[PDB]
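Cross-posted from the bioinformatics board.
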Amino acid sequence: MPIILDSDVLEVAEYVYKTRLSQPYTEVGSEWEYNYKNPTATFAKGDGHNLQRYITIDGKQLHRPIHGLAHTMRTLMYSQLMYCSSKKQPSPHVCQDGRTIADLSELDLKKINIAQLFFVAGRESEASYGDAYHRYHLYGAKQFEEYARKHLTHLFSEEEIRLYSRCIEDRVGDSFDGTPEGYIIHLSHMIDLMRCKSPVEVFLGHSGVSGIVPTLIHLFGKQDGLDIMHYARGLFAATGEAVPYIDSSEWPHLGVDLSRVQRALSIVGDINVPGQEADSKKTAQAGFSVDGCYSALTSVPTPSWYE
Amino acid sequence: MPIILDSDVLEVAEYVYKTRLSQPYTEVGSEWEYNYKNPTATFAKGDGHNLQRYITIDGKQLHRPIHGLAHTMRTLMYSQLMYCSSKKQPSPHVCQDGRTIADLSELDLKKINIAQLFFVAGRESEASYGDAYHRYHLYGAKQFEEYARKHLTHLFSEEEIRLYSRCIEDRVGDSFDGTPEGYIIHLSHMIDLMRCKSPVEVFLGVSGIVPTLIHLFGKQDGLDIMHYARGLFAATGEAVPYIDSSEWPHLGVDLSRVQRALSIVGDINVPGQEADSKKTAQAGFSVDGCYSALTSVPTPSWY
């Protein structure tokens, strides 16, 4: 059964793409370089500002390729998938407000999809150290609020605009599971990180923190958790992104506490999945238009259990 | 006679450059700083993560300058040059598998050059310590296997993919001289270390880098290989360290080691050169640019 983004959602997608996700990053250049060994004159307070600013595909510049339309749109698919899975779980995760994702309605998922469109829209570079991250999330929140108060007051109440603005903002001190709305926004973003993060971050965790895939299996069970993993990898391929290989025989040899590795192996199981190279055509099709991206996403089958 | 990189070697060079060597390092930033007074505060388990991440030249960031395209391509010149010298030696070094460099063919040197292009491709920072080294070599070995099984099966057999993958992986416990393939890979990487290591490591020593060359290839060929390397450093824009043996007694190394080094290498004085940003960029930002720079350096008369 397909995961559908309706005309209202796609209308907002067009707005976000036009006003934000298609735009060049602006906190870039020599004025934004950083040096850890020796302070220097700069605007930056950490690294990352000049990474992955744009790629060129058939002579056309795709700005912000790692946080652009495809990344954004993929996350809207994940939330709908996890909403289905949570509703099947004997004890879904209770968030700080006493509510679970299974407490959400279909209308709530529409509102969450709309907010997810803005989640990384405020970025002005790839920088991801705290100060930059927080500023960029505040900027995206303000972009959401401005649009919502002009165009979405028939759909969002005032309390809802405040809740979703805050979910986007991700203020210092906020909890990852504050509300189910915020939780699913964060989890969706986490899933998409598999495309760029190491085996350590995806499967093992650092010291505290669990790997991405083990989180999914903790929440959704092994079957649905691995199925959400595979689904996302499918969307990566459909949208032209390199699909990392997965090889659990490599895990004991990455420098991680073996206690930690063996825990990962017992949760995930032995796993071996081939990688795939990036496809520039598919990257441009998914990056340069809402309809192009959405067609790519819709090409990928959902898990058999999705309804 | 020139050292030639074949068209297929260059094809693989382009791929490794686009996919890996051009790309920014990832095990960088505030989560990878290290303070030994507080060893587990971040993800780092040692020093170096945030060292020489990139250099900006004429407005363009040249990522991983220490372990980039020019470092990698220079190593392929060295292996071809050591293969020629090995064939002149009366008793080339027998590796753990019973074979020597002189046992290799020209086709094995091509395969060796292709594996050499992945040798540091898996690095994700300048981190110096074992855990990071070994993870980075495992990553490069798997980047080579993935590429080779998709694109190189017309050239490499499955046994060869396994061999060269293991050469790049450099697993804890592996022998430096396990096979002539891996030996020559390791020797070529060490040659390139001359550009960044102290005269202690280069001359005095374990055996110093230059005395190792002289033990294996004779003093004439060994010093010629050292000089050729230093030529490729200059052609690619790298700073060329001075050599002054008159300083060797003043470095805090014991005298007996200094004497040994002078007995093997001889007195030696060679001036340094400063880095050249334009040549660094030319050699760092494209395969063709790098290969042109490497070709400009005359090879030893005996090559």
